[PDB]
Amino acid sequence: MLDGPYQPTTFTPPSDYWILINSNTNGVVYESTNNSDFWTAVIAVEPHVDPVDRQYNVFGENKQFNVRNDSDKWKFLEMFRGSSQNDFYNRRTLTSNTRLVGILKYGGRIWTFHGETPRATTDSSNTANLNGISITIHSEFYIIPRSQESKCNEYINNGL
């Protein structure tokens, strides 16, 4: 039940579907917010990057983040804030040779994968406004129903 690929766009998915983004370059992979209590932007860092300050345009704001990647695999840094006044901190990191980043709205929370392939695992983030969270996606993506999360886990950890 893997549908796609779909080209980069902005939308608000329904609950109960994994969005699986096939990142093909460094920089911002997606940006997601409800404009109240939830902002997440994922930043892709290519292998073998010494600590360095990099600039990224997220939510129309130029931000500087100090990044690194000591591993041969790509790193996907979740940058989160809970308020517009709050600084974007690296809340989770997905280290992956599969370049598959996932997001699901389910059960009043946002679910994403983090850890290191092929052992990456899901994690939840709370919000008081799940429905209002939209997403801007900068690479091609797929959709798969939550009922097939075992398959989604397989794709995140072992590839398409």
Numbering used by the authors: 3 to 162
Copy text verbatim from the article accompanying this structure deposition:
Rotaviruses are the leading etiologic agent of viral gastroenteritis in infants and young children worldwide and are responsible for an estimated 140,000 deaths each year in developing countries. Diverse interactions between histo-blood group antigens (HBGAs) and rotavirus have been described and it is believed that HBGAs expressed on the surface of target cells serve as viral receptors. The distal VP8* portion (~27 kDa, N-terminal) of the rotavirus spike protein VP4 from P, P, P and P genotypes recognize the secretor HBGAs. To understand the molecular basis of LNB and H1 recognition and binding to P VP8* we determined the crystal structure of the clinical isolate Pc VP8* in its apo form and bound to LNB and H1 glycans.
Two different crystalline forms of Pc VP8* in its apo form were obtained. The first form, VP8*-Apo1, diffracts at 1.35 Å resolution and presents a single copy of Pc VP8* in the crystal asymmetric unit (ASU) while the second form, VP8*-Apo2, diffracts to 1.5 Å and presents two copies in the ASU. The three copies of Pc VP8* in these two crystalline forms present the galectin fold with two twisted β-sheets separated by a superficial cleft that conforms the glycan binding site in P and P genotypes. Superimposition of the individual VP8* protomers from these crystals showed that the three molecules of Pc VP8* are almost identical (RMSD 0.28 Å for the superposition of all the Cα). Furthermore, Pc VP8* are also structurally identical (RMSDs 0.37–0.57 Å) to the VP8* apo forms of the linage I PWa and PRotarix, supporting that the glycan binding site is preformed in the Pc VP8* protein.
